[PDB]
Amino acid sequence: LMVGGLLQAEALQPDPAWQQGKLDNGFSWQLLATPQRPSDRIELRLIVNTGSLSENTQEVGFAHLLPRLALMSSASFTPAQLQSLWQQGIDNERPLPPAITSYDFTLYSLSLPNNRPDLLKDALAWLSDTAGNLAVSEQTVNAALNTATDPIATFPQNIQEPWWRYRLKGSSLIGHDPGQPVTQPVDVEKLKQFYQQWYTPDAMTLYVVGNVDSRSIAAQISKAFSELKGKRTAPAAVATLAPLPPEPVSLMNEQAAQDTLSLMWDTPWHPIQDSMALSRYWRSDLAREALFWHIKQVLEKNNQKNLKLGFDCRVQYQRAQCAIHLNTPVENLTANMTFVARELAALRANGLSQAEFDALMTQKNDQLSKLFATYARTDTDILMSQRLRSQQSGVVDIAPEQYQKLRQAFLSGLTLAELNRELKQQLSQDTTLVLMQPKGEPEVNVKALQEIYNGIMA
Ligand SMILES: [Zn+2]
Ligand SMILES: [Zn+2]
Ligand SMILES: [Zn+2]
Ligand SMILES: [Zn+2]
Ligand SMILES: [Zn+2]
Ligand SMILES: [Zn+2]
């Protein structure tokens, strides 16, 4: 017995449900078998770490063009077979385009019916044709440029948004719009060289979610993709944004019905490495949720003329963006902004009441109790999008039993004082006012609006 009287956190566990492997050429794959979704569609995603940032000025639009070629013709397919695949390759809801191209990636997507081994074979053949034997010729390029529509999407979905144009300023993404048309006539030889340079197996990951046979599909993936050649000499491009400037701004927008004033915060994102970071993230997230929740409730009890409120957070380009959106006619803007700003001032100073906190925590405890019920009811495409979001944005995916344990301990440990301090800290960082106006609406003086706002927040 040691004579003393008055004298760590566990490692986070990656979710072992996600089986992973690497082929000898560096091709990566990840598989989530879903026997709880035995009849749901099989989702396949091929991410290639090649986007518009890979393009020099003689290659503008090349990354966006390549996937359209893959829809004109594919080496393993007759026209009839290619059409048959794609007629049966789109999800029943939240359908995805065949490919999405962006600054630092291209994403190919197929959604197959359940219990169709033939279509799984075809899907893998289409994806391997695309990955290593893309049909790049004068004939396919001409055909692609003469389509009535553009089946290839971008991320962000609308690069032309005045908000996006503003947000892009000071970044490395300028002059690399991912959906730009190619310069014609196309140097087909240069296009093929670009494809061979940048479509290398070490820059690819295949993801599969569904009630599949994990033993046979691993073997099929190896046989489909192990012959790909090439290696990147440098790390793949990573798209990064500059910090959001602090100044208020008005942006005219041609699709807006009415104004949206956004109260925004933008900060560097630090991926969660350990349990302590996880807890800090959850405290911050819950404060954000609490505030939105509280304002929504106050609004339901105290109607404000023509106000609709929105709230969201995203992690993208290594930045965390959290926004409160006030959708309002311009005639009601100052009143509606004042309504929200007075809530923020009160929450900054005093936070939640104990009763409000206890309500919140009952609700969060309820949601946690529903964890596995929610999971069982989750469509394979949602499982897939969650995984890609985790992977692309660096937001950690942990074993669900560990999640349940750590989240329970977070909720049971959290005090009013702690949540209110987090609220105070968050709201003590100045917001950034971003006003979107409809085209044709007289410009609002956002400096004046900022002064009014500053008055309330004093
Ligand atoms: Zn022509
Ligand atoms: Zn396009
Ligand atoms: Zn938003
Ligand atoms: Zn309040
Ligand atoms: Zn689905
Ligand atoms: Zn277990």
The Cα 88–Cα 366 span in angstroms is 39
What are the residues whose beta carbons fall under 8 Å from the beta carbon of 347, sequence distance 6 or more?
A: 291, 294, 423, 427
| Residue at which a domain ends, from 198, 221, 241 | 241
Final residue in a domain of this structure, among 218, 241, 264: 241
CA atoms within 13 A on the CB side of 374: 10
Secondary structure (DSSP) of 180-195 = PPPPSS--HHHHHHHH
Residue 188 in tokens? 């087909």
Residue 128's closest CA among 176, 209, 70? 70
Q: Are residues 91 and 191 in the same domain?
A: yes
Both structure tokens of 421: 């301090």
29 by Cβ neighbours in 10 Å (0-12 / 13-18 / 19+) ranks as buried
Report the SS3 class of residue 254. coil
Would you give the DSSP letter of residue 264? E
Q: Resolution, in Å, please?
A: 1.6
The enclosing domain of 453 has a CATH number of 3.30.830.10
- Name the method of structure determination: X-ray
127 vs 329: CA distance, rounded Å: 48
Q: Report every protein residue that has its C-beta within 5 angstroms of ion ligand 3.
A: 312, 323
Nearest to 434 by CA among 446, 448, 425, 417: 446
Asked if residue 207 and residue 280 are part of one domain, the reply reads no
Are residues 232 and 349 part of one domain? Answer: no
CA 414 – CA 417 distance, rounded (Å): 8
**Longest CA–CA separation in the chain, Å:** 86
Omega prior to 400 cis, within 30 of 0:
no
Per-residue burial over 136-159, b = 16 or more CB atoms within 10 Å of its CB, e = otherwise: beeebbebbeeeeeeebbbbbeeb
Map tokens 């529903």 to a residue.
Answer: 370
As a whole number of angstroms, the distance between CA 427 and CA 437 comes to: 25
Asked whether residue 212 falls in the same domain as residue 247, the answer is no
The pair of three-digit structure tokens given for residue 202, joined into one six-digit string: 């070490």
Task: Map residue 446 onto helix, strand or coil.
Answer: helix
Domain count, the chain: 2
Which amino acid makes up residue 170? G
CA of 361 to the centre of ligand 6 (A): 26
Is the domain of 268 the same as that of 152? no
Clarify whether residues 334 and 415 are in a common domain. yes
Ligand 2 center from residue 109 Cα (angstroms): 15
Query: What six digits make up the tokens of 224?
Result: 């489909």
Q: Token pair for residue 318?
A: 């290594």
Residue found under tokens 């947000």: 167
**Residue environment code for 85-119, b if the CB has 16+ CB neighbours within 10 A, otherwise e:** bbebbebeeeebbbbbbbbbbbbbbbbbeeeeeeb
Q: Both 213 and 354 in a single domain?
A: no
Q: At what angle do helices 400-413 and 354-369 cross, to 10 degrees?
A: 170
Q: Confirm if 33 and 216 have CB atoms less than 8 A apart.
A: no
Is cis: bond before 438, omega within 30 of 0?
no
Ligand sitting nearest the alpha carbon of 402: 6
Are 166 and 275 in the same domain? no
Domain closes at, from 188, 215, 241: 241
Residues 295 and 181 in one domain: no
Q: What is the rounded CA–CA span in Å between residue 38 and residue 23? A: 28
Going by the annotation, the residues of the binding site for Zn(2+) are 64, 91, 93, 150, 152, 294, 312, 325, 343, 379, 381, 401
Co-location of 159 and 293 in the same domain: no
Comparing C-alpha atoms, which of 153, 171, 61 is closest to residue 109? 153
Distance 164 CA to ligand 5 centre (A): 29
**DSSP, res 159:** T
Residue with tokens 């007289």: 442
Distance of CA 215 to the CA centre of its chain: 30
Strand pairing partners for 260? 327, 436
Residues preceding chain discontinuities in the chain with C to N over 2.5 Å: 7
Which CA distances in Å does 187 have to 58, 102, 310, 431? Answer: 9, 22, 47, 48
Regarding whether 249 and 233 lie in a shared domain, the answer is no
Cα–Cα distance measured from residue 296 to residue 340, given in angstroms and rounded to the nearest whole number: 10
Per the listing, tokens 């986007």 go with 51
Residues 10 and 75 in one domain: yes
In this structure, the dihedral spanned by the alpha carbons of residues 184, 190, 192 and 194, taken in order and rounded to 10 degrees, is: -110
Q: Hunting for tokens 């109607």 — which residue is that?
A: 303
DSSP-derived secondary structure for 371-408: HHHHHHT--HHHHHHHHHHHHHHT---B-HHHHHHHHH
Q: Which two tokens stand for residue 369?
A: 């109790």
Report CA 37 to chain centroid distance, whole Å: 24
Ligand 5 center–CA 38 separation, angstroms: 13
User: Which residues form the domain of 267?
Assistant: 242-458
Q: What's at 217, amino acid-wise?
A: I
